Homo-oligomer: A and B are copies of this chain.
Amino acid sequence: SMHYITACLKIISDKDLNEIMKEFKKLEEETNKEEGCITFHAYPLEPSERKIMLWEIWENEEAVKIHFTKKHTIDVQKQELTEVEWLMKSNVN
């Protein structure tokens, strides 16, 4: 069994998309090292969209919650660069 998540983030920051993506790449690098993370990948939609897409697979639902307690996650969060526009969760076995 695995917990799948696909989410689209709306960028509310006015910073450069490249600068923003660097933060997401660092986050991606650190969260892939989390024990409960099967996969985590972030990438930008077309520049004009000002959106970022997330592909995630976790060992379970708790892994997602644990993820948000990690300092590397909270560090990006404190920057208030985005907010979730839509998200779809699914348990796949």
Contacts and interface: CB of A to CB of B under 8 A. Distances in A.
Interface of A: 12, 35, 62, 65-66, 69-71, 74, 80, 82-89
17 contacts: A12-B71, A35-B85, A35-B86, A62-B87, A62-B88, A62-B89, A65-B84, A65-B87, A66-B84, A66-B85, A66-B87, A69-B82, A69-B83, A69-B84, A70-B83, A70-B84, A74-B80
A89 B80 CA distance: 28
Q: Quick one: copies of this chain in the complex? A: 2
Secondary structure class of chain A's binding surface, majority of residues:
mixed
B86 A71 contact: no
Contacts of A82: 69
Sorted nearest first, the 4 A-B pairs with minimum C-beta distance are A69-B84, A66-B84, A69-B83, A70-B83
Contacts of A83: 69-71
